[PDB]
Amino acid sequence: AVIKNADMSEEMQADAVDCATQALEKYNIEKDIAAYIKKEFDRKHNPTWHCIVGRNFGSYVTHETKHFIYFYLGQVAILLFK
Template sequence: MATEKKDKLEPQIKSVDMTDDMQQEAVEVAIEAMDKYHIEKDIAQYIKKEFDSRKGATWHCVVGRNFGSFVTHETKHFIYFYLGHCAILLFKTQ
């Protein structure tokens, strides 16, 4: 079942300032989060904590279907993408 869900969740990158490897990792962590959780704040918390742990603090994550944003981020540490109908904004600040 998890494999079927992953197949359905094809990422659509909308805006990015991040290495290809880090982009892939962001998508993989987001898929893990969506497999484990169904509440948007829990998905965001999982992604944020994983990236803090893997890449160092301080990461921020917003997950949802309808939101606006305007953020300042560290160079090469920003991604905004969709998995299915869910938008994910992930970025790092100092």
């Protein structure tokens, strides 16, 4: 498990990893991963999110100051943000 760029609390980046990785192993396609994680992560921490998962990606997106993850995990990288 490798994280690259982040400013959230350490306890919720641990929550983010333990939410994401077993969900990744649970499913096989990756539209539904980025539905399931964000619905769960709404109900767990805070009432609005957006997540992207995948490979070969580029984006430009606005994160509220205390919310940003760039996973690099199984060579399927996840980025998630408020």
